[PDB]
Amino acid sequence: VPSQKTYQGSYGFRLGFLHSGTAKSVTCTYSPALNKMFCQLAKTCPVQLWVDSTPPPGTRVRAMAIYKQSQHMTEVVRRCPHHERCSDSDGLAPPQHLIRVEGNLRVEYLDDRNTFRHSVVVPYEPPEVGSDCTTIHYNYMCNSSCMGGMNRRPILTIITLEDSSGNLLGRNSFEVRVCACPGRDRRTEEENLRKK
Template identity: 60%
Template sequence: MMEKQCFEGLSLSQDLPLSQDDSFKEIWSGLIPCIATIPTLTAPQEAWPAGTMYDSLSQVLNEGFDENLFELSTEMPTTDSVTPYPSSTVPVTTDHPGEYGFQLRFQKSGTAKSVTSTYSESLNKLYCQLAKTSPVEVLVGKELPLGAVFRATAVYKKTEHVAEVVRRCPHHQNEDAAEHRSHLIRVEGSQRAQYFEDLHTKRQSVTVPYEPPQLGSEITTILLSFMCNSSCMGGMNRRPILTILTLETPEGLVLGRRCFEVRVCACPGRDRKSEEESKTKMQSGTKQTKKRKSGPPAPAPSTSSKKSKLASSAEEEDKDVYVLRVRGRERYEMFKKLNDGQELLDKENKTKTKVSVKHEPAVPSSGKRLLQRGERSDSD
């Protein structure tokens, strides 16, 4: 028997099974008679107001022990959540402002080598450095529903790669200690950003709640970072990507969509300038080819000019002297005879051309006949 003092000097006497072999259910059933002997609990119910601790404790004692009371739930929350809606296998990449007039704007950074992020309006392309913040300005035409969010998703641009999931390369994943290190797009400056992965397509996305514009402003700024270079092996591997930014309700209903191309590189300003110049050259080249096709055909070069060019080139080649190294005396004598014979042929050809030029009769002007030997002219 064990004696214990409690409740202002009242003594309680009860055998308590303290062995480790006894279950918690047996200990609970042994404590019920002890608790029932407390005078305050056996007092008239009128002394306790309705809905107080007396009613709840009495209900627990009457119902008995619940074996499932201390069981943990099998559904544990995960840091990388699942998207609340099933996304399509091939995402749509066309712009759709929707009824709220969803629009995007980018800051004008120019093409200097020192910029970390710049946007080309002619190419609809964002150039940025690895893990550097790229601000994206959002405009809406009217007030959005309560709890609206922005979702950013990366997809490949070309049709042969659009079914693949855009992920970071293994090198950058292993260097990152974040829980969502496999995600390419990251939202900076917000603790309420959530990272999702679709169960069916395995596409990854990040959401951030919509914040209304501050006083005196009409835009809301989102800070995006791209955590892998476009040239990373095992990741994008020089394949162009698109970023889809959607405006959604908390239930996943799309209210608007905007899409732009992204290139993650070491020098955004230089790459933007070179790609814009190449595009203008291509456009100007196509215009020139069209003009040439519409005009008259160019005259073909005459055969005489071709022959003169060939003769001049042959003369220039004849003036050049080449040295040939021959091994062995017999071979040297053979090549020497060939060379001497060729030199004699060249001299004979030159003398023949000079003689033919001297004996060539003069050609009379048009309308006159050559006099033969023994003939006299009409004037004689």
Template identity: 60%
Template sequence: MEEQGVENVSLPLSQESFPDLWANVVMPISTIQTAALNEPTGSWVASLTMALMDMPDLNCLFELQPSISTLDTGSPPTSTVPVTTDHPGEYDFKLRFQKSGTAKSVTSTYSELLNKLYCQLAKTSPVEVLVSKEPPKGAILRATAVYKKSEHVAEAVRRCPHHQNEDSVEHRSHLIRVEGSSQRAQYFEDLHTKRQSVTVPYEPPQLGSEFTTILLSFMCNSSCMGGMNRRPILTILTLETPEGLVLGRRCFEVRVCACPGRDRKTEEQANKKESGPKQTKKRKVTPNTSSLTTPAKKMKSSSSGEDEDKEVFHFEVYGRERYGRYEMFKKINEGLDLVESDAEKYRQKGKKKDGQTPEGPKKGKKLLVKEEKSDSD
């Protein structure tokens, strides 16, 4: 009764009932068993394979549904020395950072002068992504951290052991994380270079906006021992196709510190001093050097009791060659002052012999004059 009930049920999609299917399967199986008894072991395996291929109903029964294809985001570049130069590409790929100044309270700030991002540990740093036209469907954004100096560039950037042990996520060894879309973010590690990266699908700008914003977080300080250990790093942000083809590249330096505003201000001031013209320190010019830039003035002796001319003129000297000439002029000036000083001393001595001081005859005293004898004497 049960078999008759099953036969009477109409199955959707033109599927056959189990008795009909079994009747179609029994004959090939019996054929396979006969072939296995009559043929050697090596040949009946081939007969089994051919028999299974000739059973269309069995193939339909065990046919698997096609699996959902995941985007092959590829792996980080296998090159030991990654490319760190900017390449806007066909889509004019650009990055832009929010202006936040150098106040002590900011958690993230960007220096256009140094092309450097200053941020605090595990704090969100918004990065605006701009393109001239929409990238291919399924495009991704990849963020990779590399060391800036050539002696460290071959080494992979990782978090320090202390911060790794405090974290419980699966990708706790990664320095860069993408916030906001953590469910769509994927973390990769190259098998050859051990370099790590994180990817997130590219999203077109929303209505009324010209850019897409991604949120990056850096999970270790630049000064952490066992991690970056005060070694400067670069972040490479690339726009890629689902197959891993790079469409655009942008690089910027990153410093993870406790006070981003203060460090940015300090490094910008130091960079301006280094890039500006080298100036020699102004030496304290004595009154003796005034004759270098002014008409010759008769210097008054300090013993005259009158105030000296306190007006001083400075002039700047650039370059070592000119500095040597400056020393020569300085010696000439000192020699002229010495000659003038000696002349003044001789002049004073001459006045003393005549019985006069530099200030003239002193009051209350008469000059001693040899008495003249009369004719009678």
């Protein structure tokens, strides 16, 4: 069962997100109070890799979804049958994978031979000149509400920094809700947290 434990590690690995607010038409927004991303289906979700020191060439960055609730954590997170069969692949992603990376021709998609879990992995590259972080553009390809799939169960995304052999260098995670109205839902869930 995939670890979700924050592990900043020797390279001081953290995640950053944009400040996108809660307006009616927002497509991706991150709640620091909830450590939770709210986003629309198939829209660009920028995730920033911040490191205190640069990991070596050959380092890779893996993303994987798991169910947040203990009673569901052993079930593989997959797209629902409707979306698996709707012929919407970009030509790189297998149609069953929930998480895609856009804009990177070196992306690789893994179906674990033993656990059957899906993940998507790109080579780590240092920030561009002038930039302080490396940005990966993720897409989530089912709504949280998809009945044949996540069926309204919250998920976590786990981002792992790995060496070329798959050994752990660092780990971070965040909750995700994929929904029609991310701004509205972020505003609602943040108001609920204030009450509890």
